Design a protein around this ligand. Structure first.
Ligand SMILES: CC(C)(COP(=O)(O)OP(=O)(O)OC[C@H]1O[C@@H](n2cnc3c(N)ncnc32)[C@H](O)[C@@H]1OP(=O)(O)O)[C@@H](O)C(=O)NCCC(=O)NCCS
Ligand SMILES: CC(C)(COP(=O)(O)OP(=O)(O)OC[C@H]1O[C@@H](n2cnc3c(N)ncnc32)[C@H](O)[C@@H]1OP(=O)(O)O)[C@@H](O)C(=O)NCCC(=O)NCCS
Ligand SMILES: CC(C)(COP(=O)(O)OP(=O)(O)OC[C@H]1O[C@@H](n2cnc3c(N)ncnc32)[C@H](O)[C@@H]1OP(=O)(O)O)[C@@H](O)C(=O)NCCC(=O)NCCS
Ligand SMILES: CC(C)(COP(=O)(O)OP(=O)(O)OC[C@H]1O[C@@H](n2cnc3c(N)ncnc32)[C@H](O)[C@@H]1OP(=O)(O)O)[C@@H](O)C(=O)NCCC(=O)NCCS
Ligand SMILES: NC[C@H]1O[C@H](O[C@H]2[C@H](O)[C@@H](O[C@H]3O[C@H](CO)[C@@H](O)[C@H](N)[C@H]3O)[C@H](N)C[C@@H]2N)[C@H](N)C[C@@H]1O
Ligand SMILES: NC[C@H]1O[C@H](O[C@H]2[C@H](O)[C@@H](O[C@H]3O[C@H](CO)[C@@H](O)[C@H](N)[C@H]3O)[C@H](N)C[C@@H]2N)[C@H](N)C[C@@H]1O
Lengths: 396, 396, 396, 396
């Protein structure tokens, strides 16, 4: 039982572990298209002797952080251990090895989508974003008088087939993912897989449809079993007008009873209607997890709030070291130090705070970050707060 | 069809309307005990001729706003129109007559709990707090190493009967309601009714039990049909230690599978556990609704964030007039004016912003509040943000 | 095992059988009030030897048949055989004995409400009325432009306590039950029990409410578990304006989501709304069962349609004999004969046709009534067709 | 916003609008086969400017009315508007244009199947047939002694594969559709679609089977998820003997617990069983909708009841003129007039009455048809009543 990099002979064996560990595994076909994003020396395997019984890999992704700064991010995926080799310490060996490779490759941050909220708590990964499923009873849904595009006249939204307007979607998404914190770059290979999942599979999902705006798009599909529910798989909108214009079209679906969308907590849809409660939050869960690899490099690259007063403090990470942090006028200075620490927090506590979805005061009451200065807490709350609402791009 | 104040002969007719309109009507018995909080001329009735076919009233309450300031608040309750006289315009007359009396009684703000999120949107009421039902699978629940009171020793929490410790609960709640925004003063009569609902009703609710801490308490009861669920009806905790100590006791219930609590979104519970995903938000809804009656009086009495630069702007309320606002050092200056306005919003929009549950940027994207200056928006978001997270006190 | 009339000592044993056989047994308390409607030698018991192990009785009722004629009707009720003595022939012995007593007392017709549609098919009882449960989604419900009382002004419907208006309910019901086919007389003892079932029972049903009109009333209650459903237990309307005005009030219950009512197939409610489909038929079942005791007495006393041409024919009942029937201008002559039979049907087939709920053409297609004259068949459909729609009064 | 006839270049765009608006859309393949029934200039489209956003068409169909007379009927189908162009008045323009085209082609009546019972209420369409689902628990279902084919002997029903016996099915249906009111002519192209849906689709419906009587056929299939329910999609029987013969076969399916069938209210199935209540009506809805295009041409071509006295009256339609009607001996005379009106009804009210599914007394109670003569009402009920029970043919 040892650890090494995989070969071409290992890939048929890696699909077998994937299909048995992941129920939503996209088959042996699509995993090759996802492989084009995995860099060389970006995957680890464990053999027994010998059959492959452990695997874990990261992808080269581009995550947008607050202040429209794009960071190279290691996207952890395909992390699976055979049921016959658990409790031994294969995950502990694989994840510790990959982080060593991620740190050598020069990645400031590492990210993943968790299957459970307890596996990746100690590994330094913290829930950085929040998924927020909204379900709208569209039969009662009526827009507020203040909602944009209230008058009569040719609406700027069109009902189009998703595969026939690909070039337009790639352009809109690119404009979205650069200005919205949490946005990820979608390469050519990922549009290939997303657009192939739009056509109706025999015995699977229904045919997807698209609503097209010059500054946004809605990618929806009717549920296979619930023929009265339209499930919006994707909603990208650049302008505030584009968001409202796409929803007037979505509630326009007179064939449907309900419209469901997995979105972000600060979605302005509830206020867009007369009855705010008609946009019910049916489901809430953490989305994208973050592990800050390079502490000073990640904190400096992020954009902060201009509203907060200029302050300086010494921050301590569990086993990441001790860092001096200077925040003022939107930008931050971060350099390694050894002066007396004011705030003490674990590696995963910084992960949650980074994108600004979780307040430090909330984590302080939970005693996840410790400080004797209560005024410093109020300043970290304001400084880490993102100007543009945090969103989850896509699952990987 | 005429509107007037109720006499002693009207109450028997009023209880008829109340029982036919509200399914959870406490009965003609308990409604008289709730009446002791309604001031003279604080109720209105509509008769047909003659039987009463429309009623509305408010209660004298004390709401705590950001900055530990306690405001006199009109608590709109018992608002019902007979099913034989709907679409006739009885509510429009009654609510207008009560607001008149509320303004003449010098109340800065009015408050209610909505049965539907669309009825009171036009009357100036906006969702001021947010409810957040957390269901924790306690079997999988394990506390984080950072959680307070992690070591062994005699726990300061006791399992006591709620009716036998009334003096302690009243003392703890009074401390809680004064320091937490959204907190309401609970008089002698409401404590009488709360403890009356603790005892198990024949064929109804089960017997309530209490967990008592020197600085907090937990009121819970087993669900009538779900024998494995413990429903925490009330959780009040003054100190950060008390919150954690009470939750160790609640997860200590080895008889139960799940512990459910209706709380606020900023609850530190999920971070207390090793698995944050175990504290599942099963239900989300608006709680307390607010209508600002006296605009300058309400805004000046409120405490604001220090972590924002001093600014001044002219705010306009759709039909409430025009006001100049100066925010600096956590306090605000507000007086009526007629100089050009920089921000335009409806009366209900201010209600949502007041306690600081909703951000101004979110309402701006929904075009509920309008401005040309985007810098002002960022400042309004930070200034209105509550330091101590907002909580819903009780339902009325 | 012997059959005889019951004494005073038998009653405590009868209530044991009733409680063990009927789930909705009103207890030993209320069954004594129902006993005041059972005439002397109108009840039979079967003892073992000695304990009572079989019971059956009939009540002196007054059924209104087409043409506003009221016939004294024996109402079979409390028919139960102990589980320890079934498949023995106790029911066949009891029912034959009661049919002897009914015919000796001189009742033209016999009536019951069946627990299964197969037990009383052989005994001569046929499904005489059809129950029709309509559940209306009142949130979507909007009245048609042609619906009576569709303007502004004081509505003539009141929301009242049912127990405080007994005098008016009895008066309206009496006017209703006399003009509507299938209507039964309700004695003082039954109004006693009806109003006693209106009050809220601890762990049972909720408090019942009433909507009163000069020419009609509606008794409704919110379901014990479904707090968004209001069940109309009773809707007596004399005039067409009363029916419409009560349904404006019923849909006026803004507290509820759905209004359910068990009524008749010829209810004008669906056409009273803009969308006829909003009044969905959620449940269909047979109501009152009818067995003609005296074939010539019943057919003569009934009222027939004036539209059909005058015809004379000979009909035969399987074991009831052969009768010549002369139908012309509302009234009919029925005298026993030995001439050639043109129509042949079982005793229960006449029972179904009598009130005019089931057409003869439907039974002829099923071969329940036989004839070689198809022109005679069309004349039977028109003649037995009730001018005023057939309704079920109350269950017994 | 322009309305015109569709070209060949419009069809790919029309399929997109069809698939998005209809969930049960038969795909771009099958819609071409249905288009062989759409006559030249029998379709309309609305373009934006240009993309097609509104569409509506009618099919050349042959409906059988009471009296075995077959009328050419325009079958409205594919009527849909884009979700981006609703509340604009596209349906009002399209339907009015088609009604203008239908009248020019010389059609007496127009027909459709509605998605909601409120959209086509004002356009002149009324519920003309009634759907009636019956779920029979075949485990308890035992046939009555009077039911045809009682004793032993070789049954004249066979279990056959539907695709191998196309010739007989077309022969039986043609006999059925000509003698039964509501019967539609099913051309060569529609039998292609019906038999193509018989084969088991991967992940969809299961293999369809057929029961063949020389005078009737039964098309059934086991439900996708409910492996104990046999869904009878089609039951056509010419003789009353065949109807009973097929049901002995259907209840013969010992693999099933329940047999469901969407039929008509006057189905003689319950009277075939010893327990009439085993044939439970689980579902009840309106079927075919009829708009009378030519008032005198349709009324004269219909067969009326012989069992009614001869009468003459003047009928009006709100905005469709005034007509003199004379009914006697089964046939009617109708010519446009301007003499004082006796009966006043909307255009859709006549549609409901025409096929004889809805009684005039019920519609007069709901004030949908007004007359001061109550005697005239009783005669309209008897005259319009169809001798042969009305049935829904197929869904279009
Ligand atoms: C695959 C995998 C992580 C388990 O491998 P494993 O061999 O049990 O992991 P290890 O033995 O190295 O465990 C190391 C630590 O992680 C924790 N851990 C591992 N799997 C866990 C799980 N499913 N839930 C909670 N904690 C887990 C253990 O508590 C352990 O702590 P310790 O060091 O104090 O003993 C595990 O998640 C699994 O089997 N899941 C199914 C496949 C899957 O869906 N993967 C997740 C993709 S995001
Ligand atoms: C009680 C009550 C307001 C009904 O009275 P009503 O006579 O319909 O009220 P009015 O006719 O004065 O309504 C005036 C306006 O309020 C709106 N409105 C009133 N009740 C409403 C409801 N239940 N939902 C949505 N909007 C409502 C109407 O749209 C109307 O607008 P308009 O002025 O443009 O016509 C109504 O809320 C009700 O019946 N609710 C059930 C009883 C209850 O539980 N009370 C509410 C507790 S929050
Ligand atoms: C009460 C009662 C009928 C049972 O008595 P029993 O001794 O089984 O009746 P018998 O043996 O005299 O049955 C005589 C005939 O009636 C029929 N019958 C009796 N009970 C029946 C039932 N529950 N369902 C269908 N048919 C029944 C039998 O087919 C039998 O026919 P047969 O003479 O060809 O054998 C029976 O219905 C029962 O026990 N029900 C529970 C109490 C109850 O609810 N009463 C009925 C209210 S309508
Ligand atoms: C197709 C269609 C009716 C939408 O068109 P539309 O542009 O909204 O119709 P219009 O704006 O011309 O509406 C005209 C009238 O019809 C009524 N109406 C339109 N759609 C309606 C619906 N879904 N339900 C009830 N009423 C409706 C409106 O009340 C309006 O009345 P008004 O003249 O008093 O304002 C609509 O049914 C739809 O979008 N559904 C999806 C496709 C479908 O299923 N069609 C029905 C096939 S049978
Ligand atoms: N317009 C504001 C409305 O507020 C209240 O409704 C509210 C009820 O009062 C609430 O009931 C609560 O308050 C009542 C007393 O009013 C208590 O008896 C009960 N235990 C408690 O749950 C219930 N939980 C929610 C409901 N919206 C008033 N009853 C009616 C009034 O019209
Ligand atoms: N063979 C005819 C049978 O009719 C009745 O059953 C019927 C019950 O009497 C009915 O109960 C009704 O009648 C009883 C009184 O009999 C009322 O107390 C009750 N509120 C009311 O619902 C109930 N709704 C239906 C049931 N089939 C008799 N109880 C028993 C008798 O054998």
């Amino acid at each position: 039982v040892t650890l090494c990099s995989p070969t071409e002979d290992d890939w048929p064996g890696m699909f077998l572990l994937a299909a048995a560990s992941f129920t939503d595994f996209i088959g042996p076909e699509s995993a090759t298209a996802w492989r084009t994003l995995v860099p060389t020396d970006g995957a680890v395997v464990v053999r027994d002797g010998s059959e492959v019984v452990g695997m874990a890999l990261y992808m080269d992704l581009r995550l947008t952080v607050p202040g429209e700064v794009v960071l190279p991010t290691a996207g952890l995926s395909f992390v699976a251990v055979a049921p016959t080799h658990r409790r031994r310490g294969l995950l502990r060996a694989m994840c510790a090895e990959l982080h060593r490779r991620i740190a050598d490759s020069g990645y400031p941050v590492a990210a993943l989508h968790a299957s459970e909220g307890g596996i990746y708590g100690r590994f330094g990964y913290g829930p950085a974003t929040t998924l927020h499923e909204l379900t709208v009873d569209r039969r009662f849904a009526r827009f507020h008088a203040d909602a944009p595009g209230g008058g009569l006249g040719g609406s700027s939204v069109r009902l189009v087939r998703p595969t026939e307007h690909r070039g337009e979607f790639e352009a809109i998404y690119e404009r979205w993912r650069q200005q919205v914190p949490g946005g990820l770059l979608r390469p050519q290979v990922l549009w290939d897989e997303l657009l192939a999942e739009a056509k109706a599979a025999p015995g699977g999902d229904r045919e997807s449809f698209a609503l097209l705006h010059p500054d946004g798009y809605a990618l929806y599909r009717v549920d296979r079993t619930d023929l009265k529910l339209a499930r919006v798989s994707e909603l990208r909108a650049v302008t505030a007008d584009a968001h409202c214009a796409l929803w007037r079209a979505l509630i326009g679906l007179d064939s449907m009873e309900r419209i469901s969308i997995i979105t972000h907590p600060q979605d302005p849809l509830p206020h867009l209607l007369t009855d705010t409660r008609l946009a019910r939050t049916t489901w809430r869960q953490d989305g994208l997890w973050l592990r800050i690899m390079n502490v000073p490099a990640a904190l400096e690259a992020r954009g902060y709030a201009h509203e907060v007063g200029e302050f300086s403090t010494v921050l301590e990470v569990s086993d990441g070291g001790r860092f001096a942090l200077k925040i003022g006028d939107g930008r931050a200075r971060c350099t390694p130090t050894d002066a007396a620490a004011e705030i003490e927090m674990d590696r995963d506590v910084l992960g949650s705070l980074y994108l600004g979805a979780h307040r430090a005061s909330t984590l302080a009451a939970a005693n996840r970050l410790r400080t004797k200065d209560s005024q410093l807490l109020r300043r970290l709350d304001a400084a880490f707060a993102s100007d543009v609402p945090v969103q989850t791009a896509f699952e990987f």
